[PDB]
């Protein structure tokens, strides 16, 4: 990554790599892997991100899907940023193509040149956006359950049922409004009768804290 | 395309 | 975080993340998790705090409650800080909205801009206040016991009983004065007879050291 | 609201 | 802590926190915990010390006793440092009250202001003094044995007996002179006969090395 | 008093 | 390595060495070892790379093959860069021979001199290229399977079969176009009938995500 | 040749 | 410690403390503990050395012996450095007494003042000398064997016998010349007959390598 | 060590020491220990090297042999660098004797003075040369096998046999040309018949890759 | 004396 | 000689 008043470049540390590898091996494609990745690659260059993606042993199907997603994003970027004709002036620097953002046709010094520019051309955060999108699609695709199937057991504590519910919801393929609707509908809709009657008695304007406090005794 | 099957990430 | 004479920005380290994750997995929602969190996020930006909160695997009900608490705090902040009309001057910077304090509508450079200002707009410590409040409500809600139920066993050493007492008191939902009253009343009130008579003989103006020394033999 | 169910912390 | 030619402030590291927590969990309230604490909090601010004290899980009775000791120390400090009337001049800074030394009524920037002043107002080392005093009282109170009860077994090597002796002496509640007397009296007084006769033959002007060399064969 | 039972260290 | 505005030289850290050694011992010659190596040797000098290669215990046949590959690369470099006659001027520095790039006939200060020059003579990245080529040949030679033999089991989930497929493809000895052909032909060609019919029905213009979603139920 | 069998890497 | 062009002061790190503690717990009072100690306290101040000595749990007899040795050294230093009458000038600094070298009557800033002076008053290395002397006496006193008793077994390889020999010799209480004599006499004197005849045939002007090569077959 | 534009001195870190100790305990005197040592002591001073050598527990015979080798090297150095008569000028510094290079008669500041000079007097790399030579003699002496005895089993894969071969060759006591001859002769000479006929059919101008590919099926 | 039995190292 | 048996490395 590159950290701050001038910016300074440093390679990815051994324990950032080890951390990422062990996270992939232990948790595979759980939702919380996406923040960890973004946490382990803050300020990183395309070379660092490609380093983290190449160090993945196994899971080659998911890595291929991620490759295809990055291909879509880079192609769209090239569509939105057309090529221009001429040699680059001595003072200036060319604008990054989709292949340069992925670190394929760009050196480390060119990426540092884009990220250190004023105004900055944040190639690392753009490439990070594409990668994180692909990771979203992989996580949502490898989710075994559906939000519609989460139902509270007869003798299951309300806390556990809500845990399962939002656990499944976090990996769902839905926009913000759709998740709002799922929360305001299926949660009370799929609760067990003893607690479901109480939650219906509370009303749709109740907080989760009041719902879990209400069904704590049952 | 920028990435290809069986090829490393960030390879020319 | 951002550490000091000029301030310098650095991302959250791999072992701060690993530390936080392992603390959540091991101790879940014990009181001492709140200092550790605050210890692992000193000088942190909203992006770092959201990084620590997003890396939590499971416990999604508690994370939802924390989300709602942050919603209340941000809404109140917007009420207290009304919007103003006009474009921002070149030299100045806008004042952070409730969505900017949570890092939702603000970039990392804007948060650094608010924290580096003179006078500083400490968005990270404000967001940290909201988060720590939500964590207080989660800890107090997930406490299994009550301060009223802690009673000394007949053959239990006084040290163990006091340990249980203040263990339960630390997670209680009570103001400072209410905890003062609980300490000055229930502790001697719920002691076993052999030691309770001695503690009554000491008087309400005795220290805890004199009480534990008094009941050490019994 | 600033945070929403099923959505990450600090997301627009 | 704050380390050196100008002083620079840094938060407590993840492995200082982890070190302190694991030391408390493993060794609880052994004497050597007091140096370790002081070793883990060199140059620390009141916020760092309160961070280390708040991260203690369990042992809430001892933490309460420590709280009371700090209350005594702060009250005495306020007695010795009377309040003064007036607003603080722009160039100057107020003198810390007992509540400011404990980090309760003082921010981090104010503590840094007191520690960076010339002459320095070392609030962190003062608060550290109070805390270490309380830890002394906790260690001495949780000592299971007494210096008077340490007696050498008939077939116990002299090395082991001396180890037990000074082990108990280190946790004793006694001034320097009283410990000198305990060493010059009880050690030879409570040795087993075979070795006790030799140690009496050496005389009270012998070193511990000559005593242990003398009783090595027996 | 500066510290109180059941209250964190360094709390106002 | 040497990191950045002037460049600064630092030796390889203990945990970079330990990381590399443990990676070799655990994973031997798996594909993902090549990125890890390149990740552990970013900005490194020929001395650092030779340090990492010499710390390998066992696997001496592969290390010999790597030696021979480096011999080929260095010989070719000397062919492309002919010697020149004369003593080096005081201000200038000689151009590196194939033996200097491998760190055999060059000191550490000379390598730092080549990497710090403007324009830089990146001897470390060149030597790194040769080494990584040799590692490619070792990985491809120690691959036990062939891309032609990967066939989906009758009751094997499509995800697992694709995982095996691209796992074998990553270690294949083939150019980019040949791997494109292998992917667009053998993958659907070697799928089990139930899923193979669906994949044939999709058409050759389908993404891997649509193929795996299509065969998820079967 | 620059590297030789049984000899360390980067040795003269 | 204090490291270098001006000197900068830093406290002892958590893993230096942990390293020292674990070395004491694992290896107790083996010879190689003395270098490790000196390795963990390079450039250290009296406060750091007292920190390392106070963190020792158990072994209180040896710690007492070390205390007495330090008392002898400090008393001798005060004898060699007599007190002088007068107040210290504003520009100058007093000369350290034996109590100041041990960090008892000196603050951290005074020790930094002595070590940063030009010419330096190296109080930390002097105190380190006294401590290392005491550690020498403790190691030599806790050695279970004698150099005179090491004899080669009839079927013991020569390598093992030499290992035992120099293992015992390293902990011996003898000057350099006495150890030279022990090596040139007892080693061949206490070898088993089959090898002893060969070593006698070599002559007293043989290296250890030639002796071990000579007795390798037997 | 001392790292770089001015040089700065730092002591050996706790995990460099721990790394070295654990390497010695685990792998004893394997060839790859020599690079690791050189990797853990890059830029080190004689004091650091003596620190690493003194922290070795056990193996005292090998340490004695290393001592004797260093004695030979230092004596030769003194022969090649004769003493000169006179006091050292204020601006200059004496030339290091053999005892100064080993850190025996030289302080840390004098070694830093020699290594920081322009031109540098690299005492640390010279002492490192002597030490590494002694380690070469120890490794070659503690090798249990000979290059002449390595023969391929009848059903042993060619890869394993080559691994054993070069494993034994790396520890051999032979010059570069002698190792070239051993490789070009004994390898094909001591292969099993089925593969030996193929390797003879290839010719002496074949690479190791072609030999191992040729005998892969058998 | 500078150090005393039962007393920490470096204590006044 | 510069090093001696039973004596530490780098000792006078
Ligand atoms: Cl279900
Ligand atoms: Cl519940
Ligand atoms: Cl579920
Ligand atoms: Cl790769
Ligand atoms: Cl109860
Ligand atoms: Cl008790
Ligand atoms: Cl309880
Ligand atoms: Cl997320
Ligand atoms: Cl007893
Ligand atoms: Cl004894
Ligand atoms: Cl005892
Ligand atoms: Cl708290
Ligand atoms: Cl197969
Ligand atoms: Cl599937
Ligand atoms: Cl397979
Ligand atoms: Cl080597
Ligand atoms: Cl014996
Ligand atoms: Cl032998
Ligand atoms: Cl022995
Ligand atoms: Cl053999
Ligand atoms: Cl083979
Ligand atoms: Cl073998
Ligand atoms: Cl202490
Ligand atoms: Cl030593």
Numbering used by the authors:
A (entry chain A), C (entry chain A), E (entry chain A), G (entry chain A), I (entry chain A), J (entry chain A): 1 to 4, 8 to 221
B (entry chain B), D (entry chain B), F (entry chain B), H (entry chain B), K (entry chain B), L (entry chain B): 313 to 324
Verbatim from the authors:
During maturation of human immunodeficiency virus type 1 (HIV-1), capsid proteins (CA) assemble into a conical core (or capsid) surrounding the viral genome. Formation of a core with optimal stability is a strict requirement for efficient HIV-1 infection. CA folds into two distinct domains connected by a linker: the N-terminal domain (CANTD), composed of seven α-helices and a single β-hairpin, and the C-terminal domain (CACTD), composed of a 310-helix and four α-helices. The cores comprise ~250 CA hexamers and 12 CA pentamers.
